[PDB]
Amino acid sequence: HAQGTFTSDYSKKLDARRAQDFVQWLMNT
Ligand SMILES: *C(=O)CC[C@H](NC(=O)CC[C@H](NC(=O)CCCCCCCCCCCCCCC)C(=O)O)C(=O)O
């Protein structure tokens, strides 16, 4: 889907939604 808006418009989320919640615990121990 959105083969034209599924990549570019997908580089400003995981790297903050899959990194924040993550790196949020990784550094909590
Ligand atoms: C996020 O779900 C994908 C959104 C992304 N594009 C944008 O961030 C901007 C367009 C808009 N996005 C938003 O406003 C935020 C949407 C959040 C919805 C989250 C629901 C859960 C889905 C999780 C999917 C896995 C993604 C990795 C997260 C660990 C929009 O939604 O269109 C895009 O590429 O669509």
Distance, in Å, from the CA atom of 7 to the CA atom of 16, rounded to the nearest integer, reads 16
Distance, in Å, from the CA atom of 13 to the CA atom of 20, rounded to the nearest integer, reads 10
Q: Which two tokens stand for residue 19?
A: 């990194």
Q: Which residues line ligand 1 (CB under 6 A)?
A: 9-10, 13-14, 17-18
Q: Which two tokens stand for residue 25?
A: 């615990």
Contacts of 17 (CB under 8 A, 6+ apart): none
Distance, in Å, from the CA atom of 11 to the CA atom of 25, rounded to the nearest integer, reads 22
Gaps after residue numbers in the chain (C–N over 2.5 angstroms): none
Q: Quote the ligand 1 centre to 12 CA distance (angstroms).
A: 9
Supply the residue whose CA is at minimum distance from atom 10 of ligand 1. 9
